[PDB]
Symmetry: C4
Subunit: 91 residues, 4 copies
């Protein structure tokens, strides 16, 4: 579960990284950064896609990727750190 | 369900597209982009409504549209891609 | 319920409107706009508090107001438009 | 519970404050502000990490911290202000 969501999240971010570095000309790390802050809804106050292709892709990317990214964040917190921390809480 | 949420989301985005292209003077694609990033809470780091009418509309738009947009994203992920991916997971 | 959340949301936004117009010097409508996009997490790509008092207030404001604002958005969609739309869906 | 989430949220914000003031050179209050708006997804329309180290840290920081911060906001609203307000509601 967490493993599949992990993999699925990675592929989604790879796709965004490739798209923005190619169509929007960002350095790969910047493309990955943009993909991450966009899908987590944090957003970026400096960059917004400048091409129409980039704007359309971003719209579709958000709708398809937000669900997956938060499910991963959900399981990551509830199934990977909840107990880990909740562990020591046990005297 | 997913079909109705799909339609309802489309109409909401059409309304935003028309509003921002008219009152804020954005190109239609930019108006649609702004509507999408606003309702998904991603936001835009470049554009903010410049007119008071645009600011008031945006406030109301957010309150009325956030719920619908996320419900759609919710069902879209839980009822359209959960199984699709979860399908192959079956050996 | 929806009425109390409505009132509670209004008071929270009034407080933000007064704070930002006074300490950050925004026009009241801009102060209200900032308060709304901050508590809904949409954010603004143009304005960020410039004073330390404004930064500290914003931090506390977010933590205390996000919960209330989304609960309101939650009930507003689930208890005010779900049926309204779901109504006609009935042949 | 609320006490542990409170503590856990504080440590996460302290880590971000130290990181951004050091690597990105922000004043401590600005580093704390950035950490808060990033983890709550509000975002900042002015600042984005300028170094690759800052971009990578921010990506990891978001994934690990969003879950905790919202759980805290969740319990804070549902277990600390729900009754407090809901209290007087009792005639
Ligand atoms: Cs945002
Ligand atoms: Na958000
Ligand atoms: Na934002």
């Amino acid at each position: 579960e967490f493993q599949v969501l992990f993999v699925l999240t990675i592929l989604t971010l790879i796709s965004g990284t490739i798209f923005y570095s190619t169509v929007e000309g960002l350095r790969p790390i910047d493309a990955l950064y943009f993909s991450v802050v966009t899908l987590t809804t944090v957003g970026d106050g400096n960059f917004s896609p400048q091409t129409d292709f980039g704007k359309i892709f971003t719209i579709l990317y958000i709708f398809i990727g937000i669900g997956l990214v938060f499910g991963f964040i959900h399981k990551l917190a509830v199934n990977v750190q909840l107990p880990s921390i909740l562990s020591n809480l046990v005297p």
